[PDB]
């Protein structure tokens, strides 16, 4: 299902890449994408999957294609056109200098302050659930671990109720890794049919959580509409649920395969915080895209006024022309270069959160179970979309070899 190639597309720039579906995904969902920057492949192709888009496949074309906002928006910002367009998330589909009032509220609720806050109870949840894991010898780490620890630590933070994850996660997924089972449109309603009681209810009675600091909040001098932060929090709900959960399980299956690179953080613990930015970089998941907004010539291709772009924020720390060998996992790298959470004015806001959330669980860990690896005869799988994972990942440790704390 390829879509008709537009008259302005030379031919010489087609691969037929899908986003969604990616050729050699049994080799790694990095890998697969990586194809992209082979050789023969020009720096800015077109694909006639999802409907027909471009893909820039460079770090350069991606940081400057995303600090052009002018030529290249965000109002319809995913892959295909139908999700692009149903999107309304706050502050994502906007641009500036509008998008800034927003993303300075949204800063409030998830920014610095906020992590140095709950810092204590996540270095709490985290000991829990491992010690909790430790004794079995083995867990499900999506399910066991990468799932719970985030997502407890936002429902927290939203003040929501840990019996509605599962509801939540579904409507996530169908976002980010659209299953067929329903449409953006009606993801997205769901979604909303949810948030709004619950905002309607803090604009009423205003809690301490994130949830009623968004519904009440201050926006160009005058209040937020109801609107505006079904809208933000319909985004805050995303990133919580469905990007530091994928993360952990490509970090964890990259570690439970290296056991020098457990042994350096075990060592050299004083490396965690560089070895985060490696495994950002190497075990980057996130692809979305924008509009052109007129006709726009850029790097010699010819653009369209409402074709989509692909502007994977996967590929730039990928890139050979960024890093020297860079399927590699190097914890004494000199410069690690990506744009892992993004790139421009829409760079991300809960970045501290993450970071935090990853360094707290590697050292957490490699404390208690220094030793694990992969079950004998699973076969890891991962999935491809805006936000790629692991389906699921089997670990194995002798109980014998682990550390209470
Ligand atoms: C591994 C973790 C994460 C990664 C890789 C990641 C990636 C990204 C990327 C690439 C963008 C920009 C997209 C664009 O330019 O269209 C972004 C935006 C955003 N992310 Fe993060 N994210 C992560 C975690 C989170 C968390 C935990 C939160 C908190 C809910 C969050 C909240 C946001 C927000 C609010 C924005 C929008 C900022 C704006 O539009 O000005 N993200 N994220
Ligand atoms: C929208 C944007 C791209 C992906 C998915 C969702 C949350 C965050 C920002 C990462």
Not at 47 to 75: K, M, P, V
Not at 141 to 157: K, N, S, V
Not at 317 to 342: I, W, Y
Request: charged content about 25%; aromatic content about 8%.
């Amino acid at each position: 299902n390829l879509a008709p190639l537009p008259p302005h597309v030379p031919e010489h720039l087609v691969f037929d890449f899908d986003m969604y579906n990616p050729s050699n995904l049994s080799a790694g969902v990095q890998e697969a994408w990586a194809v992209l920057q082979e050789s023969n492949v020009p720096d800015l192709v077109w694909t006639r999957c999802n409907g027909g888009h471009w893909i820039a496949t460079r770090g350069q074309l991606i940081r400057e294609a995303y600090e052009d906002y002018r030529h290249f928006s965000s109002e319809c910002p995913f892959i295909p056109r139908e999700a692009g367009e149903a999107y309304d998330f706050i502050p994502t589909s906007m641009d500036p200098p509008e998008q800034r009032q927003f993303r300075a509220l949204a800063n409030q609720v998830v920014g610095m302050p906020v992590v140095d806050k709950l810092e204590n109870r996540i270095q709490e949840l985290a000991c829990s659930l491992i010690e909790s894991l430790r004794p079995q010898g083995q867990c499900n780490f999506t399910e066991d671990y990468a799932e719970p620890f985030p997502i407890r630590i936002f429902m927290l933070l939203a003040g929501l109720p840990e019996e509605d994850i599962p509801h939540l996660k579904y409507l996530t997924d169908q976002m980010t890794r659209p299953d067929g089972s329903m449409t953006f449109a009606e993801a997205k309603e769901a979604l909303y049919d949810y948030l709004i009681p619950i905002i309607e209810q803090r604009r009423q009675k205003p809690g301490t959580d994130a949830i009623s600091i968004v519904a009440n909040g201050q926006v160009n001098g005058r209040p937020i509409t109801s609107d505006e932060a079904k809208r933000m929090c319909g985004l805050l709900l995303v990133g919580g649920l469905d990007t530091v959960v994928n993360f952990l399980s490509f970090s964890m299956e990259f570690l439970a395969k290296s056991p020098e690179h457990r042994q350096e953080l075990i060592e050299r613990p004083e490396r965690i915080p560089a070895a985060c930015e490696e495994l950002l970089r190497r075990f980057s998941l996130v692809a979305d895209g924008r509009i052109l907004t007129s006709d726009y010539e850029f790097h010699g291709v010819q653009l369209k006024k409402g074709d989509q772009i692909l502007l994977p924020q996967m590929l730039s720390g990928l890139d050979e022309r960024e890093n020297a060998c860079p399927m590699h996992v190097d914890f004494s790298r000199q410069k690690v270069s990506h744009t892992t959470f993004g790139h421009g004015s829409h760079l991300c806001l809960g970045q501290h959160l993450a970071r935090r959330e990853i360094i707290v669980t590697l050292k957490e860990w490699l404390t208690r179970i220094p030793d694990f690896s992969i079950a004998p005869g699973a076969q890891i799988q991962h999935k491809s979309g805006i936000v790629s994972g692991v389906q699921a990942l089997p670990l194995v440790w002798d109980p014998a070899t682990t550390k209470a704390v």
